[PDB]
Structure formats: C-alpha cells, structure tokens
Design a protein around this ligand. Structure first.
Ligand SMILES: COc1cc2ncnc(Oc3ccc(NC(=O)Cn4cc(C(C)C)nn4)cc3)c2cc1OC
Length: 305
C-alpha cells in the first residue's frame, strides 16, 4: 500500500500541531535535503505538558519534489499507526507560511549501531554474582531482546501491508527501559557521503544489506526485508561492526553472494543465533522464515537464555 501514498488521507483536525507550540532546538542529523532537529513541544500528547520530541523537516537544497515526498511520508505513517517497536508519529505542521514538519517520539540513546560499538568493551555474555549485580553492562539477554523487539516491529509493519526497504542497525533507535524502535532517516541522512551506500547505476544503494533478488532484479518484498534482518542480527552480535569485513563491494562480491557465499559468524554470537542469520539468508525468498515465525523463535530463545 506504500507504493501509492498520494491517495491516503491527511486529517488536520486530528494531527495538525500549531507552530507556536513547538520550540526548535539543536540539529541531531543532516542530509543534503532533509534534517532531524530536537525540539520541545507544549501539550502534544498530555494537556499542558512539555515533551522533548524529534522533528523531520527539509533544509537548504530541497525543492518542491522533496516537499511532496515528505507529505507522502506523513500520510503513510498515519496509515501504519502505532506500535511500541516503531518510532511513532505525534503530530505535524502543514499550514501555509512555514515548512512542513513531521513530529515523532524522541529516542535519547540514538542509533543502535553506534550505541553497541560504544558499549563493546563493557559486554559480558552472562552477569555472574556478586560484583556484577549493580553494574549496567550489556549481556547476551540484552542482544536477543533487541533482536526480538525488531522482529515484533517488522511483523507489525508487514500487517499494515508495508515494507521497509532499508532495514539496518543505523535505522534502529534506542529509547529508555531497553526499548528499540524501527525508523527510516531517509532524506535526513546524507547517502552521498555515507560509506554504507554504494553507487549502482545512478542511485546510491545499501548493497551490504540487500538480498540477491534486490541487487540483480530490483525486487523489494517483505522477504527481502527478512534478508536485511539477517544482516541486522550480524550487526547486533558483532557489537556494531561493519558487515563483510575486508571485502571490496564490487561486481565480484554480488556474483559470490548470488552463488551462495555468506558471512562468517560474528565474535559475540551463540550457535542458534548464527543458524538464524543463515536461515534469513536463504537464496530462495519463500524459504526464508517469516517475521511471525522469527517472533516465535526469538521469544523462545529469549526465555531460554
Ligand atoms: C539522540 O539522538 C537522536 C534521537 C532521535 N530520536 C528520534 N528520532 C530521531 O531521528 C529520526 C529518525 C527518523 C524519523 N522518521 C521516521 O522514522 C519516519 N518513519 C517511521 C517509520 C516506521 C518504521 C513506521 N518509517 N518511517 C524521524 C526522526 C533521532 C535522531 C537522533 O540523532 C541523530
């Protein structure tokens, strides 16, 4: 349903937020045409209550084309609706006389890739008593829990007849109480400056996260998102490392992938988590597990840990 966003409704009576009730703060991230800014919203969700929020909007360089694209994003977010494991829509500023602003929940710890890399040194597979009891270290339980939460958010997205198309640790945010949320920075990330995006024809694509049918046939489905989820699991159990270490991402890489060549196990995985990665990387899309099947499997592993 996310391929024909323009026909979806925008109910202003429900979502419109007055610009004079939003106090803009410091930028969080910038792209070539879009940006994310921290802000304080007065009464966006609870009467007369100040709340820190994140705002996606355009910047110098954007044109009417990017303005149309951001309005389509707002319409699809309303259709999708809310879930604990997605970055949720709170309101929007669309009235003439100012910029289009899409207001979402603030996630204080930022992206999961940087977070896990920053905490790599503190990791312990299992917390052993007594010295570790009052220390806030990352454990195998935390990593399986983040994996389970992302599968729940993706199962929810699939139920709304939508697909992600850029699933990766850089597009997962961490909030309070160990809650992780799927997001899409889109225009607010500078893909022409980012090493995770490689030139392929004319566009800059996230080659290291793409299923072979996406690379070779330009096919995007919920099952190509399952392949990307497999790459995301490798990022989690490597504690924020970059995929395919030391491999040149060229014509040769794509051919080896198409023939069945795969990544080796990351340094902090369990045998069952590595087998889950291999299952998400089946060459045949219909033979990869579904997000509903991954939710069941990871829920059972989390309880077993
Ligand atoms: C402490 O640092 C940050 C905190 C942040 N907190 C919150 N948002 C941040 O950036 C944003 C990222 C994305 C979006 N927009 C979307 O995700 C739209 N969307 C949602 C969906 C669902 C899958 C259904 N698909 N698309 C809006 C803001 C933060 C950035 C930070 O630093 C760089």
């Amino acid at each position: 349903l996310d391929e024909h966003c323009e026909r979806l409704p925008y109910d202003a009576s429900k979502w419109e937020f007055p610009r004079d009730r939003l106090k803009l703060g410091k930028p969080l991230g910038r792209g070539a045409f879009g940006q994310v800014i921290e802000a304080d919203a007065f009464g966006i969700d609870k009467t007369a209550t100040c709340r820190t929020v994140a705002v996606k909007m355009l910047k110098e360089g954007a044109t009417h084309s990017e303005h149309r694209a951001l309005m389509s994003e707002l319409k699809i977010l309303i259709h999708i609706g809310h879930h604990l494991n997605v970055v949720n829509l709170l309101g929007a500023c669309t009235k003439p006389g100012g910029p289009l602003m899409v207001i979402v929940e603030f996630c204080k710890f930022g992206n999961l890739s940087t977070y896990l890399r920053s905490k790599r040194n503190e990791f312990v597979p299992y917390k052993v008593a007594p010295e570790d009891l009052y220390k806030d270290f990352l454990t195998l339980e935390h990593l399986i829990c983040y994996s389970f939460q992302v599968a729940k958010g993706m199962e929810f997205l699939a139920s709304r007849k939508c697909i992600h198309r850029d699933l990766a640790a850089r597009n997962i945010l961490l909030s309070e109480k160990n809650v992780v949320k799927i997001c899409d920075f889109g225009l607010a990330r500078d893909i022409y400056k980012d090493p995770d995006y490689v030139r392929k024809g004319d566009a800059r694509l996230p080659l290291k996260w793409m299923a072979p049918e996406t690379i070779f046939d330009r096919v995007y489905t919920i099952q190509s998102d399952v392949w990307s989820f497999g790459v995301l699991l490798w990022e989690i159990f490597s504690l924020g490392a970059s995929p395919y270490p030391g491999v040149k991402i060229d014509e040769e890489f794509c051919r080896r992938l198409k023939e069945g060549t795969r990544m080796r196990a990351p340094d902090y995985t369990t045998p069952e988590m590595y087998q889950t990665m291999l299952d998400c990387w089946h060459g045949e899309p219909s033979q990869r597990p579904t997000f509903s099947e991954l939710v069941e499997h990871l829920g059972n592993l989390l309880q077993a840990n």
